[PDB]
Amino acid sequence: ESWAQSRDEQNLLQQKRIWESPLLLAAKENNVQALYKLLKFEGCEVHQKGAMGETALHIAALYDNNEAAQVLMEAAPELVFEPMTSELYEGQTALHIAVINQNVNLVRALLARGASVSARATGSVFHYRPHNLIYYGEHPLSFAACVGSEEIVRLLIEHGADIRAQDSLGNTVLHILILQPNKTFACQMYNLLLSYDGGDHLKSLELVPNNQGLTPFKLAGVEGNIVMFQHLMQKRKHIQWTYGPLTSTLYDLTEIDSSGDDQSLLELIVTTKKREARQILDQTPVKELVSLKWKRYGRPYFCVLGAIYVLYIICFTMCCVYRPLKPRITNRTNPRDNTLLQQKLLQEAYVTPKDDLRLVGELVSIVGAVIILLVEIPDIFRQTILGGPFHVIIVTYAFMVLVTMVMRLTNSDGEVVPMSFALVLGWCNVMYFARGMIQKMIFGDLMRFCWQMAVVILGFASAFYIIFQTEDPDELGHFYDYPMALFSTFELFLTIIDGPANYDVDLPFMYSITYAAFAIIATLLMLNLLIAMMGDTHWRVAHERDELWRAQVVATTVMLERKLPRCLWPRSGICGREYGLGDRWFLRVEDRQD
Amino acid sequence: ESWAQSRDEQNLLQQKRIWESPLLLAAKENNVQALYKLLKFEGCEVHQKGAMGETALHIAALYDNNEAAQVLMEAAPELVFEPMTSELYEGQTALHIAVINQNVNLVRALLARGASVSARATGSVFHYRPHNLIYYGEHPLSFAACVGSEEIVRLLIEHGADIRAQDSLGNTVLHILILQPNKTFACQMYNLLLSYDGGDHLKSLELVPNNQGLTPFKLAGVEGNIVMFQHLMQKRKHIQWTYGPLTSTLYDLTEIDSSGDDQSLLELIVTTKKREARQILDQTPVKELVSLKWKRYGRPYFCVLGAIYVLYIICFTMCCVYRPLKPRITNRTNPRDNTLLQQKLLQEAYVTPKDDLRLVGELVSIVGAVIILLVEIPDIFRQTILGGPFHVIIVTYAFMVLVTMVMRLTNSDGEVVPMSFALVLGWCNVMYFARGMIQKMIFGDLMRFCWQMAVVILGFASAFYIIFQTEDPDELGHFYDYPMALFSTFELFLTIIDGPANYDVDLPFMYSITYAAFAIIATLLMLNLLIAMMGDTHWRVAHERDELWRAQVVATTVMLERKLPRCLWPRSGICGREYGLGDRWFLRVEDRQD
Numbered sequence A, B: 001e002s003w004a005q006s007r008d009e010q011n012l013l014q015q016k017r018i019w020e021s022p023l024l025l026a027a028k029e030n031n032v033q034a035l036y037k038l039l040k041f042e043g044c045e046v047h048q049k050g051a052m053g054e055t056a057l058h059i060a061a062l063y064d065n066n067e068a069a070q071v072l073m074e075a076a077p078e079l080v081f082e083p084m085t086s087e088l089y090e091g092q093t094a095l096h097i098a099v100i101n102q103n104v105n106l107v108r109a110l111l112a113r114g115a116s117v118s119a120r121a122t123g124s125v126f127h128y129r130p131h132n133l134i135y136y137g138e139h140p141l142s143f144a145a146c147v148g149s150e151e152i153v154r155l156l157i158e159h160g161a162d163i164r165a166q167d168s169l170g171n172t173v174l175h176i177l178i179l180q181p182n183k184t185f186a187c188q189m190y191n192l193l194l195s196y197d198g199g200d201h202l203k204s205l206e207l208v209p210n211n212q213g214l215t216p217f218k219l220a221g222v223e224g225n226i227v228m229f230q231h232l233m234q235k236r237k238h239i240q241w242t243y244g245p246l247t248s249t250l251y252d253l254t255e256i257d258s259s260g261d262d263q264s265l266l267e268l269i270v271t272t273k274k275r276e277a278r279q280i281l282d283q284t285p286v287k288e289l290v291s292l293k294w295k296r297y298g299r300p301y302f303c304v305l306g307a308i309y310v311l312y313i314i315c316f317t318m319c320c321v322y323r324p325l326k327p328r329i330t331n332r333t334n335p336r337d338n339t340l341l342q343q344k345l346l347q348e349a350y351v352t353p354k355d356d357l358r359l360v361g362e363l364v365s366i367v368g369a370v371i372i373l374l375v376e377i378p379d380i381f382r383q384t385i386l387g388g389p390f391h392v393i394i395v396t397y398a399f400m401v402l403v404t405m406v407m408r409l410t411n412s413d414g415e416v417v418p419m420s421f422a423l424v425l426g427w428c429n430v431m432y433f434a435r436g437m438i439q440k441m442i443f444g445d446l447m448r449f450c451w452q453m454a455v456v457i458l459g460f461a462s463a464f465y466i467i468f469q470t471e472d473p474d475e476l477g478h479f480y481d482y483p484m485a486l487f488s489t490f491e492l493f494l495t496i497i498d499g500p501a502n503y504d505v506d507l508p509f510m511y512s513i514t515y516a517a518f519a520i521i522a523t524l525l526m527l528n529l530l531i532a533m534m535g536d537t538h539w540r541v542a543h544e545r546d547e548l549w550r551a552q553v554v555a556t557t558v559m560l561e562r563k564l565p566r567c568l569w570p571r572s573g574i575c576g577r578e579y580g581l582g583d584r585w586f587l588r589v590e591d592r593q594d
């Protein structure tokens, strides 16, 4: 008995009471004579409320009967004010129904009789829910703006409709227009509502924010309304001059940039689950913005921070390729003949000769891990991937390094399990740096594979080495040497080598786990390659393959700008103050036309 | 603080000084009364220079104010001559601004007052740089030809505009027109400028070359301007006769052929990084040219030179399959039990019985290598691949043969390393010979794979044989025989055989290197195959797959014609001298129309 089933039952139940009540039936059928033979002579009590708490006038307004409505208003002018007392339509008056149906004569008549232009239809039907086919708001002015009836709109303002009115979701009439399907026609209606504003700079209707802190301009970008966005952009751009085909226009660049508490358009576009907002970046005030962010400041800091990461990880493996080794003191090798451990645990490290060199290497692996946690853990409190899952991996990597540290200081046997996870987590997070025209697009996506593949093998050969650095190399000796390890793992990448298989000997728990993940990633990269080899030249889907990368580059650029300090990464555009336009920062864009 | 940021600041700074200076503001706002209330009565000093070193007339010219400009010229006729004293617009007069905006009345008025039609706008904005949205030149005549205003063009010639004028890049008005987006409309403007030429055969405006030695016709081909190219081709073709649908036209074929110092159109098309010029080859005077070059002379000499290469390489392997062998004199085999060398060094060669047969074979491998260097090393001094990287490989191959020679005469142990590189470099450079309708296109690209694959295995099986010709065949005996070697390497091509793997035995350094390159090339050829199997029938992209090969065939044809001597490869077309048209060589082309 879902909700809907209820309204399905009520809509059927409404038509039943309309069938049953002759006053309500006559109001529906527009039976003029039957309304006089009922109201004037032993006529039913007028204030009848139907199945949906509707009056006879409500029914008269629903079906566009003006003759029958006018009879009901002259016999009982009280009704006009009565709202729908039902739960589905709590607050809806006969004026709401008259406005939506674009019954100008009935609207004009109800306004004559003094209908409330401020009545809030707070019924459950009018809620902004995916199970409601329309969302127009609460006030009757808001209904007229959505049906596109400019006649009713001004006719409502003439009778004192407050354009600043907000509904239960803190949405002005401007917010609701941007949430409408007919975008190209709502632009016209949007200008009509702005004309009736107070005409004052202060308390502007375009500035009144959503209950979720969204001005209509900002909501247009988050909702992916291209038509309303470009239209709203006209009010906030200034043409400096026109030199032949060139047009140097100056953009406002205010609500489209940082230093919103978190309120940047850019941050709202990259963090929303609306794909449709992906396209807002690509508009002519915004695309120029992020491309300049990325050219200088963006691309260099990414490669610098990336190169630092490359060194911080190659140092971690430098400490892993040479980790403390002990012999199999134990004779237990002889029992469990399957066992092939030459197990190493050592706390002989303190006395040091080529041991201290690692220690400072291990110390770097720790101070970098906490630094990683010092910049990402305070960031989860204030979560989307577009960039890629770099942040999820970068914290779990430092988690494994800290565990391996806590694994040490206890001389625990399972040192390998958390230490091996950090190897793949560390390196595979390197190929996220990979971020730094159909053919050129074939070669572009191919170099990303060569980048991702060499990165994967440098994390799994590193891992596979540790897995078998303890075990006997006479049986299952694929990785006796890092150099071999690399070359074996490389060949294992392409299925050329029957991967490391033994069955008489009990191989450690890690291999059967680390190799299973290696076998999957190696095929996905070989599958992500084929799609990049066909998908590039198969259609203009390449562009689809394309923005996504550009959208990822933008998502990364916004990330860099959040922690990097103010001294680095200066603000975009040019500030306006002396030069004399100014507190807002402006972007200078010039375009050629042909 | 990039350059651009500067001009972004200056354009904002200009509008500030315009805001600040009432004379400059009135010149912008076209305030006629405010210009009289300032110049006639205690008016500001006129020769005010703005933020961009601009006069009030410059500002008056920028925004199309004629009433305000006429006031400034009658109150101070001096201004007309003043150029922009700024660095961004050094040299720009008010006439330049009037010409671009197509303000005929202001142009006519400035010419009345005697404006310089030879003023060079040498500012940094007007430079031919990718960060400038337009490039029109320096002189005001050159501005009018680019905006398409034929009225201003002739109006400038009437006042003595030199059509032969060249800018800082040695570009005539003809050169600049070909560098314009609107190609179909610039053809019309191009004819208007030619009419005012001296009318003499000598000192023709179409013959005045670029500062980079490019006539406008030649520049059209290098820039890939199809519309200007076909248009300029009309002036240099002659219709012999018309026999029904047939039309035997005779083409000039002068600036489109060799014996330019290096100045052939063809050499300029094949060596430029402009893809767009790829399409110039395919025009109806040029496509007929290269196809005749290729049919006879081109295709045969390529196969002849190719067959010679095939023999010169099969001889090098003939000396490599049977190279001096010595035993492991040393007991060192017993130490380093991993070592599996039956190492051969010998200087017993001099005494000879089936040894001399190789020596003359080795001697051929040397005289051919220097001959290779005798034809490519003097060619680097006077670098693009289209043909493919054949030249880069052919020199490094001879480099390895010379090293192997220097490796000999020293009895060095590492003989194998440079000698094995020459094997793959020699053979894989053979499949460049591969150069010699969707389905037929499927079978066409498939035979190139069968050509490239058999060539690859004949270079790596040759290499793998040498790598294990010294090592023990009882362990890792994939290549004990060239015949086996071939068959193993063939199977290793298709991943059928777990490639040569051993871990108890220390395999030589080369295998882990030569096999890694074999594993990559074998997959790319199996990936270049799939794209040729789908890409052929997936769309008319096959053509895209297609010209590229035709463009490579043309690039190879131009290569052959450079070193081959004059006695071979006669000149294309027919010479004109008695027959009596002549010093230029002409190509006879007849076309049917339907």
Ligand SMILES: C[C@@H]1NC(=O)N[C@@H]1CCCCCC(=O)O
Pocket: A052, A054, A058, A059, A062, A089, A124, A125, A126, A127, A132, A133, A134
């Ligand atoms: C037709 C019903 N009868 C009536 O008197 N009011 C209702 C109007 C239906 C509108 C439902 C709008 C929505 O889907 O939210």
Ligand SMILES: C[C@@H]1NC(=O)N[C@@H]1CCCCCC(=O)O
Pocket: A241, A243, A246, B052, B054, B058, B059, B062, B089, B124, B125, B126, B127, B132, B133, B134
């Ligand atoms: C508008 C500026 N003000 C002015 O007096 N001259 C400038 C003209 C701008 C042209 C820039 C051409 C280019 O991009 O190179």
